[PDB]
């Protein structure tokens, strides 16, 4: 599977039939239809002891993986019951500034989307958690192009070390608090992983406020390669799944 004409999102259902399920992600967020829920709690983002390990080019995007063997970087509150541990973040992005996000807002696409992936500690490990309807919480943050994001620059700086598929580099002491916008106002809905295996395990928490990154920062994302070293060069762009049908779901708003 991938993002091309012959293996992209329209093909995924042939290997991952859940691709046509009842709670697939991403979705369009229709701002006028989202339901304000005053009983929704503020988000609690506790990233003060985060332990980043490494950065990997996985062939589809790049991951930054964290030590999730203790409560070091956790998401609580909002729509969540219990404690979700940060395992990784990654991005989805476009070939052009007018596309690249997975979620849309009134059908508007952003240049990119950051996913901070967390799992519910009551299930013991990430592999157990992805098999549960409340196993994961993914915090989604839109990227627009404008001013640089200083907290992203260390990520941009190391991408030359992981240009091709399967390359990894040490990436310790990275502070993911540098990727957050000012407001933690959010939308929330039940959905899925947006790549195979497309499991329906995710509570999506999508922040209202985008972050802005510079032209130079997003251009460095687009110089990554899908291919392995010595295979035909294919730029790593447009690694996003389009909006899926909302079906029997209500998007709730904290605001
Ligand atoms: Zn993602």
Q: Which domains does the chain have, with CATH numbers?
A: 19-253 (3.10.200.10)
> Is 60 among the catalytic positions?
yes
Report how far residue 208's alpha carbon sits from residue 183's, in angstroms, rounded to the nearest whole number.
8
115 is in an annotated binding site: yes
What is the enclosing helix (H) or strand (E) of 169?
A: strand 168-170
User: b vs e for 26-61, b when ≥16 Cβ sit within 10 Å of the residue's Cβ?
Assistant: bbbbeeeebeeeeebeebebbbeebebbebbbbbbb
Q: Which technique was used to obtain these atomic coordinates?
A: X-ray
Report how far residue 87's alpha carbon sits from residue 47's, in angstroms, rounded to the nearest whole number.
12
- Please give the span between the terminal C-alpha atoms of the chain, in angstroms, as a whole number: 37
The β-bridge relationship of strands 28-29 and 52-57 is: unpaired
Ligand 1 center from residue 104 Cα (angstroms): 14
What does DSSP assign to residue 3? S
Resolution of the coordinates, Å: 1.6
State how far the alpha carbon of 158 is from the alpha carbons of 36, 73, 152, 172, 238, in Å.
40, 22, 11, 12, 21
Ligand 1 center from residue 26 Cα (angstroms): 9
Q: Which two tokens stand for residue 240?
A: 């996003």
Looking at the chain, after which residues does the C atom sit over 2.5 Å from the next written N, breaking the chain?
none
Ligand 1 center from residue 115 Cα (angstroms): 5
Residue ranges of the alpha helices (H) in the chain?
A: 126-129, 153-158, 215-221
């Amino acid at each position: 599977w991938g993002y091309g004409k012959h293996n992209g999102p329209e093909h995924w259902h042939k290997d991952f039939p859940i691709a046509k399920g009842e709670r697939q992600s991403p979705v369009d967020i229709d701002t006028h239809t989202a339901k304000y829920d005053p009983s929704l709690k503020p988000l609690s983002v506790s990233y003060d002891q985060a332990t980043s390990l490494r950065i990997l080019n996985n062939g589809h995007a790049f991951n930054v993986c964290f030590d999730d063997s203790q409560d070091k970087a956790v998401l609580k509150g909002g729509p969540l019951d219990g404690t979700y541990r940060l395992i990784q973040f990654h991005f989805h992005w476009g070939s052009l500034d007018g596309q690249g996000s997975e979620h849309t807002v009134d059908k508007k696409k952003y240049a990119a989307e950051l996913h901070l992936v967390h799992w519910n500690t009551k299930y013991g490990d990430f592999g157990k958690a992805v098999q549960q309807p409340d196993g994961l919480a993914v915090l989604g943050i839109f990227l627009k192009v404008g001013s640089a994001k200083p907290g992203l620059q260390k990520v941009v700086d190391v991408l030359d070390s992981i240009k091709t598929k399967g390359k990894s580099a040490d990436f310790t002491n990275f502070d993911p608090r540098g990727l957050l916008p000012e407001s933690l106002d959010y939308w929330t809905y039940p959905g899925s992983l947006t790549t195979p295996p497309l499991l329906e395990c995710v509570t999506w928490i999508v922040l209202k406020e985008p972050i802005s990154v510079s032209s130079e920062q997003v251009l460095k994302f687009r110089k990554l390669n899908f291919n392995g070293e010595g295979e035909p060069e294919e730029l790593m762009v447009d690694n996003w799944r389009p909006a899926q049908p909302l079906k029997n779901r209500q998007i709730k708003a904290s605001f």
